[PDB]
Amino acid sequence: MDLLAELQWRGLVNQTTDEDGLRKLLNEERVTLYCGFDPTADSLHIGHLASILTMRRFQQAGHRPIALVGGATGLIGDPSGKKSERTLNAKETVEAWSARIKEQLGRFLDFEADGNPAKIKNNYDWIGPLDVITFLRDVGKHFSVNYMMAKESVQSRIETGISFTEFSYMMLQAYDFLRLYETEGCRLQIGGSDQWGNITAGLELIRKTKGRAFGLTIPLVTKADGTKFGKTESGTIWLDKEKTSPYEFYQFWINTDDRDVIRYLKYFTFLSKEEIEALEQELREAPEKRAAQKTLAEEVTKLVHGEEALRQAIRIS
Amino acid sequence: MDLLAELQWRGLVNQTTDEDGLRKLLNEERVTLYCGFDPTADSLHIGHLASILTMRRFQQAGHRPIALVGGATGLIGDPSGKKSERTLNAKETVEAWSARIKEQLGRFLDFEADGNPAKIKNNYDWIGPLDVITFLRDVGKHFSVNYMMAKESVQSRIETGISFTEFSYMMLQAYDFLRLYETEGCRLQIGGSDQWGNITAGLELIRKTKGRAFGLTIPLVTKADGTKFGKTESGTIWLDKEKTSPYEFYQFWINTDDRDVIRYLKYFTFLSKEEIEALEQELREAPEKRAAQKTLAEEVTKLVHGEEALRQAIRIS
Numbered sequence: 342m343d344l345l346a347e348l349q350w351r352g353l354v355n356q357t358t359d360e361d362g363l364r365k366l367l368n369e370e371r372v373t374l375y376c377g378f379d380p381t382a383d384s385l386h387i388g389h390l391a392s393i394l395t396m397r398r399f400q401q402a403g404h405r406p407i408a409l410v411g412g413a414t415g416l417i418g419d420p421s422g423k424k425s426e427r428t429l430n431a432k433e434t435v436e437a438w439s440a441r442i443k444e445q446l447g448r449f450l451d452f453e454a455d456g457n458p459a460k461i462k463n464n465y466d467w468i469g470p471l472d473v474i475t476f477l478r479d480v481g482k483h484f485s486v487n488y489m490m491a492k493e494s495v496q497s498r499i500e501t502g503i504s505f506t507e508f509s510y511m512m513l514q515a516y517d518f519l520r521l522y523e524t525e526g527c528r529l530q531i532g533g534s535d536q537w538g539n540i541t542a543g544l545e546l547i548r549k550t551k552g553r554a555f556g557l558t559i560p561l562v563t564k565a566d567g568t569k570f571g572k573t574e575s576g577t578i579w580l581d582k583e584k585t586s587p588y589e590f591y592q593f594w595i596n597t598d599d600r601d602v603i604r605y606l607k608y609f610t611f612l613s614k615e616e617i618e619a620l621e622q623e624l625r626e627a628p629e630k631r632a633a634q635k636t637l638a639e640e641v642t643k644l645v646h647g648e649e650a651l652r653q654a655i656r657i658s
Numbered sequence: 659m660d661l662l663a664e665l666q667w668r669g670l671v672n673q674t675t676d677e678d679g680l681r682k683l684l685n686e687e688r689v690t691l692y693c694g695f696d697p698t699a700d701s702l703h704i705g706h707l708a709s710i711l712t713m714r715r716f717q718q719a720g721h722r723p724i725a726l727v728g729g730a731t732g733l734i735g736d737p738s739g740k741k742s743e744r745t746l747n748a749k750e751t752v753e754a755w756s757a758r759i760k761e762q763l764g765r766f767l768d769f770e771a772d773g774n775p776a777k778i779k780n781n782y783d784w785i786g787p788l789d790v791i792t793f794l795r796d797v798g799k800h801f802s803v804n805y806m807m808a809k810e811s812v813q814s815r816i817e818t819g820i821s822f823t824e825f826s827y828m829m830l831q832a833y834d835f836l837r838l839y840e841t842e843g844c845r846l847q848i849g850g851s852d853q854w855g856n857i858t859a860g861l862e863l864i865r866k867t868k869g870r871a872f873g874l875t876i877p878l879v880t881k882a883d884g885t886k887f888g889k890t891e892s893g894t895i896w897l898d899k900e901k902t903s904p905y906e907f908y909q910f911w912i913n914t915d916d917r918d919v920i921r922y923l924k925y926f927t928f929l930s931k932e933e934i935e936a937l938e939q940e941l942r943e944a945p946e947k948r949a950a951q952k953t954l955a956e957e958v959t960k961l962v963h964g965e966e967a968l969r970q971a972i973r974i975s
């Protein structure tokens with residue numbers, strides 16, 4: 342209702358399986374929602390913050406978030422939003438990366454709350470021990486090859502090429518939703534823009550096994566110049582302060598172009614509408630002051646690294 | 659060389675991955691070959707005899723045959739030669755059927771021979787305990803969706819529809835060949851006409867994992883009238899004497915149309931070329947005698963049920 346209207350205002354809603362059905366439910370019950378994160382490196386990056394902070398927003402509005410670490414799926418690899426087949430990482434690598442990722446995820450959510458404390462989960466726990474036969478029969482029987490081929494992630498790659506490995510990824514993500522739906526009463530899955538297919542696959546599986554649940558996607562973060570959000574000359578802006586220092590993190594945000602600053606405040610910060618609006622007027626009236634930029638920089642650096650880290654960043658600058 | 663030339667003469671060769679390469683090898687070494695049989699009922703039927711007897715021919719020429727009971731794959735189901743998606747049978751059902759099938763297979767092969775005694779195997783043993791992750795990575799990475807879609811069995815069904823379950827079957831059969839190649843030095847796989855794709859899939863996997871082996875298919879048994887071989891008014895002609903009695907079995911063969919009799923003698927019997935030719939001349943000169951038909955009937959009933967069974971069939975008639 343107002344949560345969803347707020348996300349809309351912020352521009353955090355790309356698509357929704359059924360807006361009125363979801364608004365209703367959000368408004369009538371404490372909803373268990375989840376977001377999955379695959380270890381593709383030893384650290385998350387700014388590419389994951391939209392999803393992370395959106396979970397947080399959901400939690401603040403009284404819902405219960407489940408952060409899913411892709412221990413199993415990170416061993417397969419999601420073709421979604423990828424133009425090329427990826428290289429398979431080793432079990433040891435993925436296993437090691439999952440542990441770190443788990444740590445950074447925890448920073449953004451509340452574990453102390455009673456009623457809606459978060460949960461961090463690893464899909465390795467239910468996918469790890471699943472036998473191929475069970476998988477092909479219990480999950481696979483539910484999907485025709487024709488439904489799967491039409492998926493953006495696959496459609497986008499058939500000429501380019503895609504192994505059966507990556508083609509099947511959707512089944513696993515599908516399965517995650519079902520399992521979470523069953524064991525945790527999970528009724529909503531959220532994710533970036535590229536996850537639509539995987540999410541809807543999950544819904545198809547629930548529907549076909551149960552005959553209820555929703556999916557929401559966040560839009561790709563845009564730049565006025567048409568370049569790739571987070572594509573720096575320095576390389577990736579990581580959430581690990583040992584890869585990307587708080588100073589570098591801080592600088593990154595401080596250098597937001599005037600064109601993007603207001604979309605980024607809405608996306609990445611917990612400033613109200615009236616605060617965000619006031620900054621817009623300040624942006625208009627005194628753009629050399631860079632008030633929108635400092636506010637973004639401090640807000641986001643505090644979120645991710647904390648005040649002390651922010652304090653250093655400021656004094657280093 | 660002569661084995662292969664003989665099969666050719668008989669019309670037991672539909673296709674071959676590389677005839678000269680296979681002829682060479684057959685002629686230079688004791689070849690380990692295999693044929694897989696999926697429990698789709700509690701008994702084999704006359705639809706499986708071409709493959710079975712061909713194994714036997716291979717064994718008689720000094721090669722070692724491996725009869726594979728599809729304990730695992732029989733739980734997935736092969737779309738090959740099927741116009742429609744099949745219903746999944748239960749583990750208990752399949753398990754029970756595998757045991758029977760194992761029994762009928764054993765009748766046709768030699769276990770006493772030293773140098774080339776047969777082996778009966780069950781793919782449940784290596785597929786049963788395989789985890790989905792291992793499967794998607796170790797087997798799946800080797801196949802593009804584009805290679806698999808072009809397969810006759812899939813191509814033939816995309817509009818009609820095919821689940822991911824049946825679509826993946828080829829991977830399992832693929833895997834069987836690899837495993838048998840590795841543990842038993844299996845260099846040749848044989849099967850009916852509809853297995854070409856599954857066989858070649860196996861070869862693709864070996865090639866891609868090892869960088870040697872061959873595939874041979876038997877043609878669909880034809881009728882001059884253009885009807886379906888084995889399609890009786892009575893229903894299936896089973897190899898279990900409790901489903902189809904030796905008398906009924908015997909009768910079935912005795913009623914072979916003059917048009918087919920000679921193709922069936924070549925296919926299903928161990929009569930020489932000169933014996934088969936002589937019967938052709940007898941067929942020409944005295945077709946009301948039905949000498950070709952009696953010979954077929956006795957030869958095949960003896961093979962499958964034995965002399966005593968044949969003796970009863972004859973006296974019952």
Ligand SMILES: N[C@@H](Cc1ccc(O)cc1)C(=O)O
Pocket residue numbers: 376377378379409411414419464513514515517518532536539
């Ligand atoms: N596929 C998502 C991560 C994910 C993994 C498993 C899930 O169940 C959900 C999401 C990505 O690549 O970002």
Ligand SMILES: N[C@@H](Cc1ccc(O)cc1)C(=O)O
Pocket residue numbers: 693694695696726728731736781830831832834835849853856
């Ligand atoms: N697919 C074959 C049987 C088979 C099973 C497993 C194999 O490895 C080989 C063959 C059939 O349906 O008749």
